[PDB]
């Protein structure tokens, strides 16, 4: 049932097809583009003084669901530290994710690091490296350098009797001083979000399903999800 890990440091690997891109930057949005075949999503997380994730996902398009389904891998953690001994408050702090472009490989690189509250005071810090490479063959957006800046909060369904996360996030594209690509048109509306984390963390193994819906329009998503172990 109770995941293994906290809550918050599964947020980024549980969709950035969602971010909203300021019309004067839609030429730069990779990961509308690449829909509906989609791309896959790679990550190392490497939390400071502690273990890693390796993350691979692939998302795209299932009929008219936006599904991310994802394998994680975490090593090397400690026991008694910040992620296994559930040290993290529940919140998430804004951050910028830069974004650029991996010309050869006709997709995105993004560096970032993620900043989690420590229950005591200290932060607990989660260094992404992360990589995105289209599935399909047609032409994709490939971006200038620009970032994504987030913002985000975390609840709790008050009669859901399973370990659970309810998620409710914005993002809009920056920094770069009708549609760009035919993907984009994929996401004029609200399109419905189906995630599916199969996860082994130092040999602790979980799973997590999340559903909800996102719209790109305003940069929103609304997620609910539930540890399935």
Not at 28 to 39: L, R, T, V
Not at 157 to 181: C, Q, W, Y
């Amino acid at each position: 049932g109770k995941l293994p890990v906290p809550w918050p440091t599964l947020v980024t690997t549980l969709v950035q097809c969602f971010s909203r891109y300021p019309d004067h930057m839609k030429r730069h949005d990779f990961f509308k583009s690449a829909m509906p075949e989609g791309y896959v999503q790679e990550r190392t997380i490497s939390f400071k003084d502690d273990g890693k994730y390796k993350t691979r996902a692939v998302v795209k398009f299932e009929g008219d669901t936006l599904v991310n389904r994802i394998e994680l891998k975490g090593t090397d953690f400690k026991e008694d530290g910040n992620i296994l001994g559930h040290k993290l408050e529940y919140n998430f702090n804004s951050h910028n994710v830069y974004i650029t472009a991996d010309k050869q490989k006709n997709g995105i690189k993004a560096n970032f690091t993620v900043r989690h509250n420590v229950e005591d005071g200290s932060v607990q810090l989660a260094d992404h490296y992360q990589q995105n490479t289209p599935i399909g063959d047609g032409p994709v957006l490939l971006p200038d350098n620009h970032y994504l800046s987030t913002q985000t909060v975390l609840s709790k369904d008050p009669n859901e009797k399973r370990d659970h996360m309810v998620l409710l996030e914005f993002v809009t594209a920056a920094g770069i001083t009708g549609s760009a690509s035919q993907g984009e048109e994929l996401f004029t509306g609200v399109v419905p979000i189906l995630v599916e984390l199969d996860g082994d963390v130092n040999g602790h193994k979980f799973s997590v399903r999340g559903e909800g819906e996102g719209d790109a329009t305003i940069g929103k998503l609304t997620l609910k999800f539930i540890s399935t172990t």
